[PDB]
Amino acid sequence: MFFLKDLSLILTLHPSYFGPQMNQYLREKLLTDVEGTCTGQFGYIVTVLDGMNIDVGKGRIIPGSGSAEFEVKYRAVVWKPFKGEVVDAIVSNVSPIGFFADVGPLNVFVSTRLIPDNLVYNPSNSPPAYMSNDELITKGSKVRLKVVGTRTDVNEIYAIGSIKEDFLGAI
Amino acid sequence: DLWRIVQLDLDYHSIHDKKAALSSIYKQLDLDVVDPTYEEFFGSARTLSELQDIDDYLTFNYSSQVKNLTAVMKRKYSKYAIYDRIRQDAIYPVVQSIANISQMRENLAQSKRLHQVEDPIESPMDMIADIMSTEKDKTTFISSEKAYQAVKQFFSEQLSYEPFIRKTIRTAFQSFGVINIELTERGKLQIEPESPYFDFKYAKNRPISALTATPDLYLRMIQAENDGLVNIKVELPMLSTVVDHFYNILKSDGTSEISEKWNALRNDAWKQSLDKLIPLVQLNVKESIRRDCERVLYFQVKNSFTKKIDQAPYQPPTYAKGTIPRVLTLSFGEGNR
Amino acid sequence: VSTSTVGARRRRAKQQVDDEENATLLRLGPEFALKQYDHDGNEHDLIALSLSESRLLIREALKARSRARNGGVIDDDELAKVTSGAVANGVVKKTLDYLNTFARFKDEETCTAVDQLLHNSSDCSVLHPFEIAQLSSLGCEDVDEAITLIPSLAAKKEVNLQRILDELNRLEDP
Amino acid sequence: ELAILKEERTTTPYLTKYERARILGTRALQISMNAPVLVDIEGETDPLQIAMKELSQRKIPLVIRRYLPDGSYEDWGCDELIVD
Amino acid sequence: RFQAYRKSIKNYKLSDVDYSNERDWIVEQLKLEKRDFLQHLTQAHSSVAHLE
Amino acid sequence: RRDFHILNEAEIFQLLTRETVDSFRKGMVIPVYVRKVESSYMSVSTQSLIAGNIQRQDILEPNDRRDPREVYSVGQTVRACILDVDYYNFKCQLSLLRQFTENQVAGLNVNRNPKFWDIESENRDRQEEIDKQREESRESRVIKHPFFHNMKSKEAEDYLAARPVGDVVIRPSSKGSNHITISWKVAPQLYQHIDVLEENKDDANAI
Amino acid sequence: QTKRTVIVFSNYLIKSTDSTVSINESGRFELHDLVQVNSDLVGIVIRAQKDSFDVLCSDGKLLSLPPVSIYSKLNLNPNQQIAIDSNGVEVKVGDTVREFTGERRQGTILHVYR
């Protein structure tokens, strides 16, 4: 789910960049170091609002190292999945152990043990799919799934979905 | 070849369930008149792609009947609901008057003109507007242009779901198609002169028939495609020839401006049907070539492994073959001080 | 890396059950609590975003940045290519693809009307912003379906759920 | 809040010896780390000497933040503090 | 090995009509795949009738 | 089963050096390591312990008349091109001539037939990347002088407009950091820009 | 690690919200080890597991293999691990270089092979 959050970043600048263009350079450095990153605490930062008018304040010189430390506060759009949430998805891969879907930047893996039994995996089909009499879910097929668990990594998030309840599966 | 026999029997055992499912579905439809296209394409059905084509044709031309049989509730939206509304609406007679479905099928199957597409006495816009004005109560369309677009898209869907057009396009692509590769920005930057993907960075018009002799090239192209670097495109040099031939079969012979409008509508719907049909045929051909190359490489690896492990023990002189010799091994590993 | 405006949170002895993330229970954790603070420390509400609002905001910000980088002189692919960073480019491409392929409302005025309906409504004056975002995003059609997908709305029976769903379906472009 | 406005600054308008020493050290370190020099150098090569030359001409781009006992502070530019 | 191959196959024992159809489909598949081998065999050993 | 398979020269070479015959043959460039320098030859070692030698005709350029020891010393690895390979004896001869170490770039044998290869696309991408290589960055110049002002030509003329005749301003020149433009007021609404060439510059920002 | 379903009794499980598994004292190879996958493929270790290892090869792909399957570590002396840049200047282990073209990235050299 997408949100607006007020975040802050600590930026350290080498003395070789102490020029008139210091502020703009700090702005592009912030944009390059925040746009697209993935933090387990917050999720995924997709964009920074008002990216060219961010206040940086006054940097403090670190005693003994010369480099200046800047405290940058900004507002950004953040997306983070939650346990027990039902969202739309697009299937990216089909495999006997289960199928992998994509919910924005997040890639969700659904095991066969969380798939209804009538959706038997068909490897002979082109492309291979988990199909039933009235349902056929393959690569590129819209699916509505509920996120059950989320795994936190260093700079990545792994989520597990399920389609075993009602109003789920193919859409 | 015996391993191929085992694989082929497994494949047919798999597709037998699908063909039985299609037979059961058709029996549940219980058509008053047996559809000649159904019989003709079911008798010659060999691949699961053709079975899927049969299923699509049956579901499209009997969407109401198939939906009822499903009913004979999760609010899944039927993708054919709009077409069912068109069937129920007063504009469906105009869609009939464009061209007779049975006559179209006979002409296409014969590949030559058996009947002439009769142009209605009034232009498509004339008939659409007249029926809209005389049936404002039932015509669900708002403007005559909207009804015109709906009729064109319905005709395009009818042409697209015709099994014969799909079969002809698939045969043409499988016989005379070529392979072209496009590069994404990731492909534009990551395909380096030392990378193994550099062999096909700018390949063009590669014959399909020659691919089976070199499976690794196609496998590597697919692997590069899966990495988000390249895009594989299959195109036919004579696609315009097939389009023109099918248009000539479908087009009417009238010369009046009303006939000109009817021919324009038919041609536009036919182009839309081609636009919808091309990706599916491309994917089917791609999967077929993938399976062929994979099987070739599987057999090649099997032969290589067999050659690797086919060696009898060393035969000492003055002894028969198969005798185990006494052996002494001397080694030091590296040779450093 | 990035630090939230909420700090402190030192050691204690009590342990609470409203700490684990759970969408059904509407327990979003401390950093996503209902009450937030801005850079001035004033009171602030949690700001959820539906796919329509998120798409509008991301498109506006990206096109503003693209215009600024060109000296103030539409395509999603070009707009994604505007940003810097290959991984960032891929992430924004994926988000844009998701938003485009599931955009319930691609028009500013439709989204504005939807937000006005979901905010100014007397029944919706109690609705949690997460519930509002879920309702505007999932595009549910039935009261039972919405309740099954959103367990929180089951306990809120003072909501004109069916007519609001029909209003959303009407506002949804067919 | 904690910052004190420029009009109501009540600390001494002179550069104390501790502030002078710290400013010279920081500027010398920054110059030794390839920071731009804001004054013309005739033949000088020692970072400390360049820093002293910058200070004499009121060209050091640093700000002194003087902490009052209660936690409030005053920000003085090194170009507006009088140096002996 | 056959059990492993047929583990996914729920229904294996086909009818006689289905059996003959399977044989015909297998023959056609081999003829399509081994067309080069059959052509070379027919061309080299043209004297023998109905080798295929 | 067939009798025991005896390894041949190629198989023994691949087993020992772990280097395939294709990846180690004529017309290849490898970073060999110099192990012994002599007047008439240089003895070098490859990465895979393959001892190599070069006759004196190739260590140094044919035009140069220096000594092999002066130019190259022990421990100074250099690029070399394979000329001959003794697979049985694991001996190779190398060349240091730049006609091999530098000109050999498109070492792949990929068929570039225009019917099946898009030569035009690869060429266009090649000038694209070459122009990208040509692209560089530039920054402003800062000078400390009482009469120096970072202004444009029109900006300098307007600044001198408010001043009487004869006042002088100094601004960076468009011909490069080694050039300086001096603008002085010849007459009311009449100014002369004079370019000054700098010699023996200590730094770009320096005078 | 194996990314596969495992069935174990509830008596052998503890609810630990964080893994932070240390792979030390296990197998023969550690992180950032240049090992030989087979007779043809040579790679480096990116992530170690209690049951297997993750190896990035010279081609640019990722593989998962048991510790037994790996041939051995490619112990190379400085007289063997030698790198030469485009201009011909020798570059040793741990030095920072920048890509001449492409993404033009930069980093510290971990291992040199061919």
TrEMBL record, chain A:
Keywords: DNA-directed RNA polymerase, Nucleus, Transcription
Highest rank taxon of the organism: Eukaryota
UniProt-recorded Gene Ontology molecular function terms: RNA-directed RNA polymerase activity; single-stranded DNA binding; single-stranded RNA binding; translation initiation factor binding
S1 motif domain residues: 84-164
CDD domains per UniProt: RNAP_II_Rpb7_N, S1_RNAPII_Rpb7
A cellular-component GO term for this protein: P-body
Annotated SUPFAM superfamilies: N-terminal, heterodimerisation domain of RBP7 (RpoE), Nucleic acid-binding proteins
Keyword Transcription attributed: yes
A single BP term in Gene Ontology: transcription elongation by RNA polymerase II
Compartment annotation: Nucleus
Family according to the record: Belongs to the eukaryotic RPB7/RPC8 RNA polymerase subunit family.
Function: DNA-dependent RNA polymerase which catalyzes the transcription of DNA into RNA using the four ribonucleoside triphosphates as substrates.
Record-given protein name: DNA-directed RNA polymerase subunit
Organism (species): Komagataella phaffii (strain GS115 / ATCC 20864)
Organismal lineage: Eukaryota, Fungi, Dikarya, Ascomycota, Saccharomycotina
TrEMBL record, chain C:
Domain RNA polymerase Rpb4/RPC9 core, first and last residues per copy: 40-174
Example of a GO cellular component annotation carried by this entry: P-body
InterPro entries: HRDC-like_sf (IPR010997), RNA_pol_Rpb4/RPC9_core (IPR006590), Rpb4-like (IPR045222), Rpb4/RPC9 (IPR005574), Rpb4/RPC9_sf (IPR038324)
Entry GO MF terms: DNA-directed RNA polymerase activity; nucleotide binding; RNA-directed RNA polymerase activity; single-stranded DNA binding; single-stranded RNA binding; translation initiation factor binding
UniProt region (Disordered), positions on chain: 1-18
Biological process according to GO: nuclear-transcribed mRNA catabolic process, deadenylation-dependent decay; positive regulation of translational initiation; transcription elongation by RNA polymerase II; transcription initiation at RNA polymerase II promoter
Predominant localisation class: nucleus
Signal peptide: none
Keywords: Nucleus
Subcellular localization, as worded in the UniProt entry: Nucleus
Family membership: Belongs to the eukaryotic RPB4 RNA polymerase subunit family.
PANTHER family reported for this sequence: DNA-DIRECTED RNA POLYMERASE II
Name recorded for this polypeptide: RNA polymerase II subunit B32
Organism of provenance: Komagataella phaffii (strain GS115 / ATCC 20864) (Yeast)
UniProtKB/TrEMBL annotation, chain D:
Lineage top rank: taxon: Eukaryota
A molecular function (GO) term: DNA binding
Single GO BP term: transcription by RNA polymerase II
Main location: nucleus
Regions crossing the membrane: none
Annotated compartments: Nucleus
GO cellular component, as recorded: RNA polymerase I complex; RNA polymerase II, core complex; RNA polymerase III complex
Keywords assigned by UniProt, alphabetized: DNA-directed RNA polymerase, Nucleus, Phosphoprotein, Transcription
Similarity section: Belongs to the archaeal Rpo6/eukaryotic RPB6 RNA polymerase subunit family.
Protein's recorded name: DNA-directed RNA polymerases I, II, and III subunit RPABC2
Residues of the full protein shown: 71 to 154 of 155
TrEMBL record, chain E:
Family: Belongs to the SPT6 family.
Species assigned in the record: Komagataella phaffii (strain GS115 / ATCC 20864) (Yeast)
Subcellular location: Chromosome; Nucleus
Functional note: Plays a role in maintenance of chromatin structure during RNA polymerase II transcription elongation thereby repressing transcription initiation from cryptic promoters. Mediates the reassembly of nucleosomes onto the promoters of at least a selected set of genes during repression; the nucleosome reassembly is essential for transcriptional repression. Histone H3-H4 chaperone that plays a role in maintenance of chromatin structure during RNA polymerase II transcription elongation thereby repressing transcription initiation from cryptic promoters. Mediates the reassembly of nucleosomes onto the promoters of at least a selected set of genes during repression; the nucleosome reassembly is essential for transcriptional repression. Essential for viability.
Included stretch of the parent chain: 309 to 360 of 1500
Protein's recorded name: Transcription elongation factor Spt6
